[PDB]
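Build the 3D complex.
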Amino acid sequence: DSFVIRGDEVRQIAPGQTGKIADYNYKLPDDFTGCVIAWNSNNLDSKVG
Amino acid sequence: SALGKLQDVVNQNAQALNTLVKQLSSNFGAISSVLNDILSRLDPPEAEV
Amino acid sequence: ASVYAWNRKRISNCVADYSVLYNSASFSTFKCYGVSPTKLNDLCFTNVYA
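Done.
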């Protein structure tokens, strides 16, 4: 499950979390089995303009 | 005190029931001893604990 | 006020909506500890201090 979010919003992608994108964009179950991969993509998903 | 044995049986049964009732008022390390309070105060991840 | 002289404001006799706090994205940290943030609108309180 792949998506792009901010650098401070990475803590919300976890079971039992509360947040903005945790409610309105992407929700995980409380008994969630599996796990998340996160990395910095500042060189590919950013433009000066 | 002639009928002490029957009264003792009755007292022990009533006292055991009263102790069982009183044990509902203990929180056993939880935030509250009332289930309704916990359910109306917390989300399922922490209310579950 | 400074941290060593933190100001304590008593909240009483009002109807408070915590949606305006939870729905705003300005707050970097919005953590409630003894209560769920979304259940605050369903509760009655006193001894509220800011």
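The longest helix of chain C spans residues 19-22.
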